[PDB]
């Protein structure tokens, strides 16, 4: 079956500051979601201004590492967003990483792809074909009919 | 007063594989709801084609073993259709069972009651009136009016 | 910026004596608010009736000690609310300290503020101003543009 | 591979009217441990005078029900008397049950086997063959050699 | 029984601006221990050259916020230095708050009591007789012989 | 000071397939150790036997994808081998990573650096030196004197 979408989730540099890395990583993989990639990038004008496709937003993402990372699994895109919480803090719920972790709209401790399509340009950039694992969960057999 | 409300909890065996066993019996114990039997089986032709009242599913439910449960407390069958979450995973909420551990419709962690009717037939199927545990639960009188 | 908004959350003599206290603290701290004070009380017959501006819901509250705290941060009180979920337990989400450990209306584990007026006089009332610390959050940097 | 080792674990009442039924089956489970068959019952005069091969400590045992468990794993005996910790709380170390949640050397929140002869003894005393599942546990490939 | 032993557990302040709180206050309220006083208090010139009966040492104690409290229990002074761990915390084991949270013997996140005469006099230093709550805790009869 | 000790801890494929690695990655987290750099690799036969400077050995490691990360901080060396806990899991205690998760020798769930000269050696194998990160955790300033 075609389980093998894939979003990228990353750990913006609030997040990574404030320790919530492994936190986050966990309402990944606990789902059944199957990590894919994962690396620590101090962000670049470049790699940046391609991104974002505000002055001040710039270099507030240069400020810190970034935990970039990649996930595969099914419905992964929209399940990731769902995960995460509306985007404003204020107003997403808690059990979501932004509704648990978050106050402010200008941090809020991680970024997620809004589509498929978002998602795969956004990976593409970010990581090289060569640097995605992939691997059978073990637990595949019984995350999925 | 009448919080004597039961309703049968079972553990899918996708969630017992996984291991999402303590977990799950963690979201009921720490609500104040009451255990009051459990036991780990290993379903029947019989016992399931008499439950539920398709023909991959049958050995699917045969494939693992189960963790039956009853969980006695005020609104409980209401209250764990609300904690298991959605039925399909993929629109569950994060902070229920179903959307924090679970993917495929097929695969969805546990099974809940969905009627006080519902629940009294299918605890009496799943277990004996012997097997079931009364006592108070000490928290009993802190928990409720 | 006026991030110095301020709730009042105590847990209800049920949260104490039930054990949530650390687990109710952790909502509030580890979404990156402050705690501003805290004491353990006994709580008094005026201190109450001039709270509460139910001849059983008195003895209630004077039936157990009362953790009142005082929380410093960007829109704390709706936050707050949020936070600890429905005030009817039975109606209140998962991933909220109502939804995750109540069960009761009468039995709802804690109290949070209702309006920034609510609070305001409500933390006056339970504390004086000299007991109130202000110290600035290392994270504070981190959690806010 | 011998790794068919199993031990009983119960749960002692105060244990199970403290709440800690979900977080003492957390450290078994995530272990990597099977769990083999589990019951909850009220302890009877024979079936404990039987057991214990003190004259109040008698009717503490039968004063709340019993969480009797059987868990199966290579080295499980004394990997179980390790996850319990000493048998009096007030020197058995952090990180183990009976040093994170325990403090009274008669209320030491469970029981566990003190040998291979002593686990299988008490196992068929507290049930019958029938009532023990096995399946393979599907985490065994990755967690034996 | 003489259950009423009472230690002096307080948070340094790198360990309120850290975060640690609510985490430092569960290993004692799940352990059974009775949370019997609690402030925030930003240490005095005085209060603090009366307590430790280091020029650099003072400013930093200053520097922050500190959770004091005071916790009730059987042998609770002991436990408490237990459940903190070796003072220096490159030498603490794992399971411990300085073991899990700490790395400089400077920065060791909390203090506790090293005796009960250390304890008594530090309380009654820290907080009037006023101030600590006495209830019984629900859990006592469950806790305790 | 030199606090930028940095040692290799990776999650060894068992490790991944069962689902460890947020939980891994946390008691480095919270300990107050700095993600440095990580990334998600299958095993090459060169990289590995230029490691391990056993014959069914190989292919395990091989046989899923490996966790390499990357830790500052002071004494993060031998901190680490201790959060690990002794290689043999059936002698690791609990609390630690070994104790908590393994049974087996042979799945030992993760790898640590035995010494400074081994760490060294062994990152600039698995990473180059342009793959690592450093910023200055925000939380260094409470964490270190």
Redesign the interface.
Known sequence: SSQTERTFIAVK??G????L?????????????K????????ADDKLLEQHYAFPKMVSFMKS??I?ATVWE???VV??GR??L?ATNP?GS????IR?????????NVCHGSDSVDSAEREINLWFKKE?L?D?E???A?????
């Open positions: 540099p609030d990574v500051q404030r320790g890395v492994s936190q986050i990583l966990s309402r990944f993989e606990k789902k059944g979601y990590l894919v990639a994962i690396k620590l990038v101090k810190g590492p935990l699994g099914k419905d929209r399940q769902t995960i919480g204020l719920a808690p059990g979501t509704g648990d972790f978050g106050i402010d709209l200008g941090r640097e694992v691997w969960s073990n637990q057999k019984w995350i999925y009919e």
